[PDB]
Structures are given as C-alpha cells and as structure tokens.
Amino acid sequence: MSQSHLDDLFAYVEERCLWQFFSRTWDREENIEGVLNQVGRLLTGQEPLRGTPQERLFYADALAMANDVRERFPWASQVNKEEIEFLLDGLKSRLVDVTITRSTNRELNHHLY
Amino acid sequence: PMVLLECDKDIPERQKHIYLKAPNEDTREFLPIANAATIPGTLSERGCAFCGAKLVIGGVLKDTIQMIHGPLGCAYDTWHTKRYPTDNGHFNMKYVWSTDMKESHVVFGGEKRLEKSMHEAFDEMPDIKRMIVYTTCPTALIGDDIKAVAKKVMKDRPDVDVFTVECPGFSGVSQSKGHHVLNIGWINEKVETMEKEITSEYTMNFIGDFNIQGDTQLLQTYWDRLGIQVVAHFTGNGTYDDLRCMHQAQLNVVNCARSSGYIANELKKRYGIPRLDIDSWGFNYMAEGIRKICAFFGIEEKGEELIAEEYAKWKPKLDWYKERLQGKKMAIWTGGPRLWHWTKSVEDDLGVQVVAMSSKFGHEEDFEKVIARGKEGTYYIDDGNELEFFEIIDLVKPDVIFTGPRVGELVKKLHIPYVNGHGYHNGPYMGFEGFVNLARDMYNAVHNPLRHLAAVDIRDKSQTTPVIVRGAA
Amino acid sequence: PAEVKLSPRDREGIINPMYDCQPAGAQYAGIGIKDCIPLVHGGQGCTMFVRLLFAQHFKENFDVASTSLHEESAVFGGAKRVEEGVLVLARRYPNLRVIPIITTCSTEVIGDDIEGSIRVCNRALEAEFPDRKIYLAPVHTPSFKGSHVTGYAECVKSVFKTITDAHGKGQPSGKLNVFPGWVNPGDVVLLKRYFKEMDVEANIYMDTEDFDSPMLPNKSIETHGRTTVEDIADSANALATLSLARYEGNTTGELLQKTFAVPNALVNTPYGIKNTDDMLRKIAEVTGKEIPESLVRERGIALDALADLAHMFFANKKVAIFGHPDLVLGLAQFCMEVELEPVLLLIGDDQGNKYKKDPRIEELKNTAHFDIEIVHNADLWELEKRINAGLQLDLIMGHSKGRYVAIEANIPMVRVGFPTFDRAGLYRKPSIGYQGAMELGEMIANAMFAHMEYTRNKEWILNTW
Ligand code: CLF
Ligand SMILES: [Mg+2]
Ligand SMILES: [Mg+2]
Ligand SMILES: [S]
C-alpha cells in the first residue's frame, strides 16, 4: 500500500545512505532534492542528468539507491511512473522532517564550516 | 529511552548522553548531547585539541617536520603511539620535535626559542623543507605568535614552507577542535599554492584516511587498477606539497567525515569539487563506494571487473568467518566514526551484533548516523567514562570489544577479549581484504584457548581444564 | 689523556625527547599507592597520553583522572574544575583515600590556587562524608622545568608530607623505609626477597609488585599499588631510610630526617655487583643484621654467569647508555665490571648543575681507561647524530623510544629503564641486585649473539664458549 512503500524507502535510506547527514542544513536540502530526483528518473526509465560534476555525483548516489530499491522491493517494478514520483515526493518530505526540521543537531545552521 | 546508569547517580547530567534504542521510538527525541564540555574527575576517554591536529592529521605526512611549540611533554606523548606507515621509511613515526619551552620562555616569551628550534630542525635534516608548527597549552597562554615566526623563517629561508596551527589542549572540549582548526587553516592558506601534472582523465582526492597499518596503500591498489589519479590523500601516506594541490581534483571522496569533512565542504564551496561520502571499511560497503566513484567517472565496467575479482579472492574467507562469528556480541569504544562505519557492516558481512557503542568526541552528526544504522537494544554513549564501561559490560555482556589497548588490558581481567579499534591488531582493515583481516582478528580474539583456561579454578576438585578446537579460513 | 667530560646539548630545541614532563612522573608516583587516583589539573591530553604510556610499559590500565581544563577556565581560572573533579572522584569511588592534585604547564601558568582549592574540598568532603578521610596532596609540577624524574620525586615528597603531617610520629616501628626510585615490579620482588633473607622488616615505597596482575578465575582486578596510607604514615616511625636513587626519592628520605629524625642513608643505585655489595653493607650497618649466606650464593651465581661473557664477548666493546640519571650512572659502573666500555652516557633533562656534583662521576673519572662523554640535557637525536658522524658503538642500552636509532644503525640494543614497550615481560625481570646484574649481562650477550647470526659475523663461534 502507498504508506508501506514509503516506509520501505525511508527505512532503506536511513540504514544505508550518508548524503542526508551532511554537515549543514543547506547541504542536506541540496542532497535530498538532487539524489531523489535522479532516483525517480532511474526508477522510471528516464535519461539521468550527468552534465555538471554535481549532477554526476547525484547520479552516482542515486544509482546505488535505485538498484538497491529494485533488488529489495518487488513493488518498485510494479507501480507506475506517477506512483514512483508521488512516493519520492513523500520521501523528500520525510527526510527533510527527520534530518532538518526535527533534528536537534545544533551545528546544522552554523554559517561557517 | 535516555539512561541514568547507577554509576552516574551523582552526575545525573550523563543521562542525556546515553541512549538505549527501544522499539517504536522517534529517534529525533533521543539524540545524545555530544561535543559538550567534559565533567571533571570522571575518567572520560577524551584527549586534547593538540592531539587532533598533530597526532591524528598533520603527523601522518611523510616529509614534514612536526614542530611542537611547548614544553617537551606534548612531544614525548605523541611519539611511538601511532601506526601510520609510509613508503619512505616511516620518517613520520621515527621523529618528534619540541621547542623545549623553559621557565624563562614563560617569563620573556617563546618566539625566539621557536625560531631557533625551527632553523635547527632544518639544519639537522637538510633534505626536509616542510614543517607544521603547533601551539600547546602554555604557548597559547603567553600569546606567542607562531604565524609571525613562521613568516620570518620563510622570508629568511626561501626554500622552506611552514604551516601553523593554534591548538592548545584547553581549546574546545576534545581532539575535535584540533581537526577543525587544522582543516580550515590549510584550505585558507596552502591549497592552490602549487600545482602538479595531471596524468589521468579521472582525478580525485581521498579525504579523511590516515593510512592506519597501510589502509591508504591498500586502497591505492584500487585507484591504480581503475586508472584514477589521486591528487592528494588527506593525509595517509601523504606529502605536504600534494596537499597544496587539492584544488585540482575533479572529485573529493570522504571516509572520515568527522575529522576531514570541513576541508571537503570548503573545497566544494570554493572550487566546486563535489563531496562523495563512502564507507571504506566493510566488504559490501567498499563495493558500493567503488561503484559510486566509477559511476561519477563513467568507468563502470572497470569497477565491475575490480569488484568481481576482489569478491572471488576474498568473499569465501569472509563467509567462513561469518559462519563462526554470527550472533557474537560486539562493543565499539572509539572516537566516533568507526561506530557508524562498523555497526551495520559487521552485522551485514559477519553476522555480528553491536550491543554498545561509545564515542569520545563525536558530534550530534555522528550520533545521527550511528543511531540510523544501529540496532534496537543497543547503548549509544557520548563521552563515556570508565565506570560506565563496567556497568555497560554487565548490561550487554559483549563477546569482544573494539577499543584502545589500555581499555583492552582492563577488560581482559573480566575475560573479555579485545581488538584494537584504533590502531588495529593485524591490519590493514579497509577495503575487501581489510575486512577479512578484521574478521580474522575478531575470530582469533574470541575463540581463544586462554579465555577458557582463565575461567578454570584449579582448586575446584568439580572442574577440569578443557581443550577447544579452533579453525582457520 | 684519559677524560670523563660533562657537556650540555648544543641545540635549543629537542628532537626525540628522552623523558616525559614532570606531571607524567607525578602520575607514576601516585599509581603505586593503594586506593589512590591522581587528579591531573590541566588539559585532557596531560592525563590520557600518560595513561597510554603506562599501558605501553606495563600492558596494564592504571586509573588517573583529569580536571578537563577548557577555554573558560583558561580565561577566568580553573579552581572550579579541581573542586568538581575531587568531589566527582569521591562520590563515584567510595574506597578512594588519596588524591595527589598534580599541576601542569597550563595550571602553573594561570596560577590556580591549589592549596585554596584543597581547603574548599576538605570542608566539602568532611561535611558530605563524615566517616571518610581523603588525603589531598598538592603536587606542583610545571612541565617547563625538570622532567618526569623530578616530577616523580616531587609527588612522592608531597604525598609523604601530606600523610605524615596528618598522623605525626607514633611508636617506633623497627622497620626501614626504602625508596628504590623508579624501578620495575621485578626490582621490587628482588628487594623484598633480599630484606626477607636478611630478616629486615622494610616498607618499599611504592610497592608496585602487583602491577603485574593475574587474570583470575573470579575476574577480580588486582592491578593496584600496595603502599597504603598506613604504610606511608609509618615512615615517621622507621629506624632509618635507605634511599637508592639520588634523583628519585632521596629528597623524601631527607624530609623524613628533618621532620622526624629518621636518619637517611643515600647509597649508589644497586646496578652491578659493587653497588649491590655496598647497599647490603649499609643495610647491615643500620640494622645490625648480618648479610645472609643466600646472598653470597646469589652473588656467586651472578659472577659465575658474567665470567662466561666478560673477556670473551664484552671486552673492549663500546656502549652508549641513556635513561634516568641513577640508572645511567649505575649501569655505566656495571658495564665496567664486565669489561664493557660505556663511552657515551646521555641524561635527558636540565639538572646538570646537580649531575656535576654526583659522586659517581668522580668514581668514573678515577676508573675509566677510555674517554667518556656525559651529555646532559640530552635528547635521543644527540645519540643518532653522533652515530651518523662516525661514533662506533657495539651496544646501546636504553628505553624503547630509542629503538629506531639502534634498528637503523644495525647496533644491538638492550631495553632498560622506562618505557620498555617493544619487548615482552621486561617489567618482571630484575635489573638491580646480583640476579639483576646476571639478567642484564645475559640480555647483552643474547642480543650480541642474535646480531652475530643475523649479520653472519663469526656466527660459528657460539659453540664452545
Ligand atoms: S592538554 Fe604537555 S603533556 Fe601537559 S603538562 Fe604541558 S608539557 Fe606535559 Fe594537550 S597541549 Fe599538551 S598534551 Fe597536555 S600540555 Fe596541553
Ligand atoms: Mg530503521
Ligand atoms: Mg656457571
Ligand atoms: S578526544
């Protein structure tokens, strides 16, 4: 069901990925958006963006997650493009909530690195 | 929930530093305080800011004088204690330098004593033309301006290059502050002060790896196979001048995000070089990392050839250890990052259950990572102390502890074996082969006749002395 | 042209320090006391690096705490960190009795009033724990003078002052006080046996035998100093003090002589045969007890062993020695007894004005038939540089932080003194006394023998010696 699928994706990211745990709020936001937009493209057969260095690295992170999601979760090969997009939008929101909005990590907004 | 241990009844602030992960909790409500002041008198494991700058990062370099501006103890104490080999005869481990600060320098100043020491060091070793100068507690307190001295020395001796770090041991709360001060000064002052030849279409820096027992040299066999030039390693088996070239790289690959994330963040901000975080410990982690690097460069097939060969070579041994280590309980009491690099990798690849973890100096960032990857029923401790370690052992009864040698020698009395989680037993521990090395040491530590022998009281008529049967992969 | 010369290091800086700083030595003094946790007032590295050093030498944990000086205390003073640290120790370690409060470079520079903090803590402790007595000893150990040798001596003296001030003079004990200095558990075991065989009651300060602790069936931790408050308090009541080390405890023997009229006898540190003989003669003199036949026999066994080595393998071989001053001077005498030639003696701190007056220098000047250079305020670069300049050595005797000098120069090396982390079990092997002389001589020969084999230097000769 759509909440079970989203829970599957969120549990995967939390136990596996590092890009949502970068040093500052602005970097977490950039990575959540950049990586998950590429994941959506890869899970729906769209041409990945591989132009700039930053795009190429979001592709690299996203490829690991897209390949793992297809391997772990049969549903991810059954649902349609719009359903994948909806799930990934919900996953962005959840990751911003737990890694930014409700994180008590007191360094996240320090202007200097 | 957060845990008030019995040994902390009179220091109850410690409860906000100890999380026991329980079912259905929102972990955002239970993140340990971290990177806060130490409680005096606790037997905290923490060290000082100077340690983080000189011992951990700067002192790794193979071709650099490590000039410690202070009394001789800070120098003595950071010599014969690390295991970071080089390919030039281990210059970094053979020598340490002090300005030998005396009472007269406290009274009148230490700047001329530093300047004299610096010229002596260059005169005694005329092949060495690079130096890092560090402050220590009393040279900070008297206000010696080591940057100004270094400036004069470089003016007077134009064939040397000197970098300085202000890192007295009372700065910050732990070694972490030393990491930060060094990272930011290096990128501010020394990056893009020279350039090197580019010899590949694919270039990277490897940031946050300090060549413990040859880890960096092992990973370099991967980069050489893949045809990737490493512009600089920060700082394993590195050189001062390679670090001046870091702006040239196309990609920054980070392992130690704690000590070295700062310079990766600044390289991205200033030069546009993307930051890729990996795990260079863990078998299946190493495969993910290689695949990401190769996806970034567009050399995916070369990555898959390397991975296939490494799995053919090492996976059968890894799986032999997994069969025998499955279900064993492990504690990790180290600096911080190895908690989040190891908890799930030993679980996935070796079947090992990490039941307790303590970080000396980790930030809340490090706790986010470890709690995300770690198990329910595990204890997560910020700035743990010795009495807490005993109480935790009684709570979780580990089969093995990955920690430093002194704590290993303490828990031996309780018949608990250790592996050196810092300097390793028989490393390297990074990469595919390295995780097999880690598994071998864990196996030999726990399945050890001496542990069984120690438990037997020969006076007990009722007891015999057993024999155990061991194995090898 | 026969010359024993004292000279200082000619560089202002240090490369490869021989000793640690004063606070490290103060910590070492304190860990030999039962129910003692030293509190090191300063930054955290000043504690943790020394706990590591002890683990390197002994392969054991020892408990030492920090006051965790941080930035606020560096601006406003650190007294509150001392006071908190004392109470946190007392509250969490119910059996704790002794806390040497050891200063560091930071807390000496900023001038924290340690004695004022002790008055605060004494009041607090008396109110919170009415039936407990905790002895707080102020130990002033700025690291910008002296070394861990001086810091050891300062801590012993302060602890003794503190505890004896509290208990004063009582009934005569009939015992000796003995300050062996900074020695291994194996040296302590040997001295206990000597006193037992001579029927002499003695306290050895500090008694570190149990630093070599068992791994027991009941999982008990026994890695403690054995010297108690009571043992230290009873020093006021002794028949006499035997001080074996001029730089490592003699000043406590003098303090007990000034304060309590316990006569102090300083003897040469008992490295080699003559120094051991003279120690036993002084024990006999002060106690009226005869030297036993068992010690004549141990002496004779040692001599018999050394005689198999001296003219065959040792004569005319050139030796460099580094370590604590009492050890360096005593080992130079031992070397001479077995026909070795100690041509270079390195002593690692700023106490040259005292070393110039040491009577053992004169004993060397009046005996050696070869030049001796004694370098004071030395570092270990002073050894490596002299070898690089052409000094020909057959042997180095020193601690493990000199190992790379010997390895790279391809010179055999016997590990002596502190720390000896790069060989196994040396803390258990006596170096003083007759047995110790024999053990040292056989280490030297066995190191030479292995070297002959690895270098193929007449390796066939090890058959019918
Ligand atoms: S926190 Fe140095 S060991 Fe100390 S008493 Fe000073 S000489 Fe000796 Fe860190 S910078 Fe160093 S190690 Fe400590 S002093 Fe500070
Ligand atoms: Mg989860
Ligand atoms: Mg014989
Ligand atoms: S630390």
Curated annotation (Swiss-Prot), chain A:
Known cofactor(s): iron-sulfur cluster; vanadium cation
Keyword vocabulary terms for this entry: ATP-binding, Iron, Iron-sulfur, Metal-binding, Nitrogen fixation, Nucleotide-binding, Oxidoreductase, Vanadium
GO biological process, one term: nitrogen fixation
EC identifiers of the protein: 1.18.6.1
Record InterPro entries: Nase_V-Fe_dsu, V/Nase_d_su
Reactions accelerated catalytically: N2 + 8 reduced [2Fe-2S]-[ferredoxin] + 16 ATP + 16 H2O = H2 + 8 oxidized [2Fe-2S]-[ferredoxin] + 2 NH4(+) + 16 ADP + 16 phosphate + 6 H(+)
Domain of life the protein comes from: Bacteria
Gene Ontology molecular function, alphabetical: ATP binding; iron-sulfur cluster binding; metal ion binding; nitrogenase activity
Assembly and oligomerization: Hexamer of two alpha, two beta, and two delta chains.
Function, in words: The key enzymatic reactions in nitrogen fixation are catalyzed by the nitrogenase complex, which has 2 components: the iron protein (component 2) and a component 1 which is either a molybdenum-iron protein, a vanadium-iron, or an iron-iron protein.
Protein name: Nitrogenase vanadium-iron protein delta chain
Species: Azotobacter vinelandii
UniProtKB/Swiss-Prot annotation, chain B:
Top EC class of this enzyme: oxidoreductase
Cofactor note: Binds 1 [8Fe-7S] cluster per heterodimer. Binds 1 [7Fe-V-9S-C-homocitryl] cluster per subunit.
Keywords of this entry: ATP-binding, Iron, Iron-sulfur, Metal-binding, Nitrogen fixation, Nucleotide-binding, Oxidoreductase, Vanadium
GO molecular function: ATP binding; iron-sulfur cluster binding; nitrogenase activity; vanadium ion binding
Recorded superkingdom: Bacteria
GO biological process: nitrogen fixation
Keyword Metal-binding set for record: yes
InterPro entries named among the record's database cross-references: Nase/OxRdtase_comp1 (IPR000510), Nase_asu (IPR005974), Nase_comp1_asu (IPR010143), Nase_comp1_CS (IPR000318), Nase_V-Fe_asu (IPR010142)
Pfam family, one: Oxidored_nitro
Coiled-coil boundaries: none
Cofactor(s) needed for function: [8Fe-7S] cluster; [7Fe-V-9S-C-homocitryl] cluster
UniProt EC number: 1.18.6.1
NCBIfam families named in the record: alt_nitrog_alph (TIGR01284), N2-ase-Ialpha (TIGR01862), VNFD (TIGR01860)
Function: This vanadium-iron protein is part of the nitrogenase complex that catalyzes the key enzymatic reactions in nitrogen fixation.
The name this protein goes by in its record: Nitrogenase vanadium-iron protein alpha chain
Source species of the chain: Azotobacter vinelandii
UniProtKB/Swiss-Prot annotation, chain C:
One annotated GO molecular function: iron-sulfur cluster binding
Keywords: ATP-binding, Iron, Iron-sulfur, Metal-binding, Nitrogen fixation, Nucleotide-binding, Oxidoreductase
Cofactor details (free text): Binds 1 [8Fe-7S] cluster per heterodimer.
One Pfam family of this chain: Oxidored_nitro
Cross-referenced InterPro entries: ChlB/BchB/BchZ, Nase/OxRdtase_comp1, Nase_comp1_CS, Nase_VnfK
GO CC annotations, alphabetized: vanadium-iron nitrogenase complex
EC code: 1.18.6.1
One of the GO biological process terms: nitrogen fixation
Binding site for [8Fe-7S] cluster: C21, C46, C105, S143
Cofactor: [8Fe-7S] cluster
Chemical reaction(s) catalysed: N2 + 8 reduced [2Fe-2S]-[ferredoxin] + 16 ATP + 16 H2O = H2 + 8 oxidized [2Fe-2S]-[ferredoxin] + 2 NH4(+) + 16 ADP + 16 phosphate + 6 H(+)
Family: Belongs to the NifD/NifK/NifE/NifN family.
NCBIfam families in the cross-refs: vnfK_nitrog (TIGR02932)
Cross-referenced PANTHER family: LIGHT-INDEPENDENT PROTOCHLOROPHYLLIDE REDUCTASE SUBUNIT B
Subunit structure of this chain's protein: Hexamer of two alpha, two beta, and two delta chains.
Role summary: This vanadium-iron protein is part of the nitrogenase complex that catalyzes the key enzymatic reactions in nitrogen fixation.
Name this polypeptide is given: Nitrogenase vanadium-iron protein beta chain
Species this protein is from: Azotobacter vinelandii
Gene transcribed to yield this protein: vnfK
